[PDB]
Amino acid sequence: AESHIILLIQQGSDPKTRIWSDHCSLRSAIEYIVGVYQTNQDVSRFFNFFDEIYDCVPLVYDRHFRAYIPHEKQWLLHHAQEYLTAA
Amino acid sequence: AESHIILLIQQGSDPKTRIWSDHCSLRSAIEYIVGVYQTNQDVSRFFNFFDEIYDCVPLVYDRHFRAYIPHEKQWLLHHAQEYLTAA
């Protein structure tokens, strides 16, 4: 219901690594995956980490239709690229 | 996208217990939470376990509108009650 973004992460096929987190904004979702990347150690290295080591899917809350919309991993990764280049 | 149900579980306020799972049916989602209950040990005991020890929220995929609809914990627990009484 409330949470703007629900993030679904996993490391390979291990069901024990399937961790979800709730975020009040896209910024908060981006800071979370940068956090995952930082604690488990460049744009190319960041993208490859989320293509080979971890997998992630954002579910974005559509307030008008009271529904969660799944978005592609590349959508969140592209927005993260815009955060990392600015900061 | 594909997964009929996404289950979000947690044990208290610990972010490390926030585990998600994907299910092809409501039956599969029910067998999963019965599994959680069985491995962490009656209708009254089952309901109280999911009201005090673990918390759970099902996200049900609406194929026509390509969206995940969050449902109340009681909705899944009520359906689980119908599975446990029959079996």
Numbering used by the authors:
A (entry chain A), B (entry chain A): 6 to 46, 55 to 100
Task: Give the authors' words.
Closely related proteins, sharing around 30% sequence identity with human ERH, are also present in Schizosaccharomyces such as S. pombe and in few other fungi. Erh1 cooperates with Mmi1 to target meiosis-specific transcripts for degradation by the nuclear exosome. Erh1 not only suppresses the meiotic program in vegetative cells but also stimulates meiosis progression.
Larger crystals could be obtained by increasing the drop volume, varying the ammonium sulfate concentration and the buffer. Erh1 monomer folds as an α-β protein composed of a four stranded anti-parallel β-sheet and three α helices packed onto the same face of the β-sheet. This fold is similar to that of metazoan ERH (rmsd values of 1.1–1.9 Å over 80 Cα atoms). Protomers A and B are virtually identical (rmsd values of 0.27 Å over 84 Cα atoms) while protomer C slightly differs as illustrated by its higher rmsd value when compared to the two other chains (1.3–1.4 Å over 84 Cα atoms). The largest differences between protomer C and the two other Erh1 molecules present in the asymmetric unit occur at helix α2 (2.5 Å translation along the helix longitudinal axis), at the hinge between helix α2 and the N-terminal extremity of strand β3, and to a lesser extent on helix α3 (1.3 Å translation). Among the three copies present in the asymmetric unit, protomers B and C associate to form a tight homodimer with a butterfly-like shape while the protomer A forms a similar homodimer with a symmetry-related molecule (rmsd of 1.1 Å over 160 Cα atoms). In the homodimer, the Erh1 β-sheet face from each monomer, which is not packed against α helices, interacts to form a β-barrel.
